Each structure stands twice: as C-alpha cells, then as structure tokens.
Amino acid sequence: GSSGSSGVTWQPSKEGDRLIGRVILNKRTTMPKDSGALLGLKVVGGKMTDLGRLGAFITKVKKGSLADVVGHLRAGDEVLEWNGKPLPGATNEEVYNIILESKSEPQVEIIVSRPSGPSSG
C-alpha cells in the first residue's frame, strides 16, 4: 500500500485563469451507505462541458467526509481526474466504473478545476 502525503492543494492552471485542486484520500474500507466508492460525494459523469467535451461534476458532498475535511471540495467542481483517470471524454457509464474501481484502492487522488477567484462578498 502506497502511503503518500494527503490533504488538498490549490494552484493556477496552465493558463492561470483556473485553479486546479489536487486532493488525495487514504481509506481502507468501502463506504457503508450506497455510495459506490465515493469518498463522500455524488459525482455525475457523462455530462456536457462548456468546452464541448464530456466531464464529471460534484452534485453533493457529505459533511465531515474525507472529501469535505481533507479535500474541502464543493458541489459543482469539475472532477478532472479521479485516481489518475481522465473523467472527461467518457460517458456516465464509464466514469462510474472508474470511480467504483477505486472502491478497492487504499488511496485515491481527486483532481478538480475551480474558477480562480472565490466569492468573498
């Protein structure tokens, strides 16, 4: 089992206009509820993107979950890569399998893209 640094890191994208969020979790058990290898959030793949291609996005995030305390993610973030797999470019049927396959992985790396510039007020 590979044990690497965990948490969450936010950095500017290739262009610098976006913010690539790098999150990683280390679990040794499949969620109790009917999640399906979900660190603690519902992901919808096979979705459409403003770019014209497919991509996955978070619709909900459990409170107190790894993807909520260690990842600090939110609903709407476009999941770029899930455990080293390109979510975008595939259907919801292919994206689900990729995320579910991690159900047996002692470590998962979630990489989402956020619009550089959080709302303050």
From Swiss-Prot:
Gene name of the encoded protein: RIMS1
Function text: Rab effector involved in exocytosis. May act as scaffold protein that regulates neurotransmitter release at the active zone. Essential for maintaining normal probability of neurotransmitter release and for regulating release during short-term synaptic plasticity. Plays a role in dendrite formation by melanocytes.
Quaternary state and interactors: Binds RAB3A, RAB3B and RAB3D that have been activated by GTP-binding. Interacts with RAB3C, RAB10, RAB26 and RAB37. Binds UNC13A. Interacts with TSPOAP1 and RIMBP2. Interacts with PPFIA3 and PPFIA4. Interacts with ERC1. Binds SNAP25, SYT1 and CACNA1B. Interaction with SYT1 is enhanced by calcium ions. Interaction with SNAP25 is weaker in the presence of calcium ions.
Subcellular location(s) per record: Cell membrane; Synapse; Presynaptic cell membrane
Protein name: Regulating synaptic membrane exocytosis protein 1
Post-translational modification: Phosphorylated by BRSK1.
Residues of the full protein shown: 585 to 692 of 1692
Domain of life of the organism encoding this protein: Eukaryota
Ranges where the PDZ domain occurs: 28-114
Tissue: Expressed in melanocytes. Detected in brain and retina.
Transmembrane regions: none
